[PDB]
Amino acid sequence: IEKNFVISDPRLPDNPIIFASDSFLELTEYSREEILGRNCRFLQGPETDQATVQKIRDAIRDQREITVQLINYTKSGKKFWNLFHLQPMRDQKGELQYFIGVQLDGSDHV
Ligand SMILES: Cc1cc2nc3c(=O)[nH]c(=O)nc-3n(C[C@H](O)[C@H](O)[C@H](O)COP(=O)(O)O)c2cc1C
């Protein structure tokens, strides 16, 4: 159904990643041990558009899905366009439980 994704737990301090797919590890160049328990903002850097970061922050605040594009960086500092989709995940009682974040490398590396 999906390839690059992480799951965060917003009920833990600073909404840490608690699950990452094998593909996300490949995309970002980080190991599972290097990722788990951190907020995904570590992928950001100098050319990340702060207006877009604000949009994601607001979408998380409002618990709404969003589909944006933003500059991210791999472990080794390789800049890429992240085509990013956020989706809140609620339990049957309607209470927020997780966020799923889906990433795609929107850059051509010919
Ligand atoms: C599940 C999930 C996945 C996320 N994935 C990314 C990502 O791949 N790249 C990125 O720049 N930010 C990602 N974020 C956004 C940051 O974690 C953070 O919410 C954003 O930078 C805005 O909050 P801040 O202003 O406190 O940094 C993700 C957030 C969540 C909840």
Swiss-Prot record:
Biotechnological applications listed in the UniProt record: The flavoproteins improved LOV (iLOVs) are fluorescent flavoproteins engineered from PHOT2 by improving its photostability and brighteness, and which maybe used as oxygen-independent fluorescent reporters with a small size. The iLOVs are PHOT2 fragments (385-496) and contain many amino-acid substitutions relative to cv. Columbia, to confer different properties in term of stablity, brightness and color.
Disrupted-gene phenotype: Plants lacking both PHOT1 and PHOT2 have curled downward leaves missing color changes and lower petiole angles in response to weak or strong blue light (BL). Impaired proton H(+) pumping associated with altered increased ATP hydrolysis and absence of binding between 14-3-3 protein and H(+)-ATPase (e.g. AHA1 and AHA2) in response to BL in guard cells of plants missing PHOT1 and PHOT2.
Mutagenesis or variant effect for C40A: Severe loss of light-sensing and light-dependent autophosphorylation
Induction / repression: Light fluence rate-dependent induction, independent of light quality.
Binding, FMN 2: N39, R41, Q44, R57, N72, N82, F84, Q103
Domain of life assignment: Eukaryota
PTM section of the record: Autophosphorylated in response to blue light irradiation.
Every PAC domain range: 64-110
Domain PAS: 1-63
Subcellular location: Cell membrane
Tissue specificity as recorded in UniProt: Expressed in leaves, stems and flowers, and to a lower extent in roots. Present in guard cells (at protein level).
Signal sequence extent: none
Residues bearing the modification S-4a-FMN cysteine: C40
Notes concerning its domains: The activation loop within the kinase domain is the target of phosphorylation. The PAS (PER-ARNT-SIM) domains are required for the binding of FMN chromophores.
More about this protein: Undergoes a photocycle characterized by fluorescence and absorption changes induced by blue light. Half-time of photoproduct formation is 11 seconds and 15 seconds for dark regeneration.
Quaternary structure (record): Homodimer. Interacts with PKS1, PKS2, RPT3 and PHOT1. Associates with CBC1 and CBC2. Binds to BHP.
Function of the molecule: Protein kinase that acts as a blue light photoreceptor in a signal-transduction pathway for photo-induced movements. Triggers the phosphorylation of AHA1 and AHA2 C-terminal penultimate Thr in guard cells to activate them and induce stomatal opening in response to blue light (BL). Also phosphorylates BLUS1, a kinase involved in stomatal opening. Mediates calcium spiking of extra- and intracellular origins in response to blue light. Involved in hypocotyl phototropism.
Family: Belongs to the protein kinase superfamily. AGC Ser/Thr protein kinase family.
Protein name as annotated: Phototropin-2
Organism (species): Arabidopsis thaliana
Name of the coding gene: PHOT2
Full protein segment contained here: 387 to 496 of 915
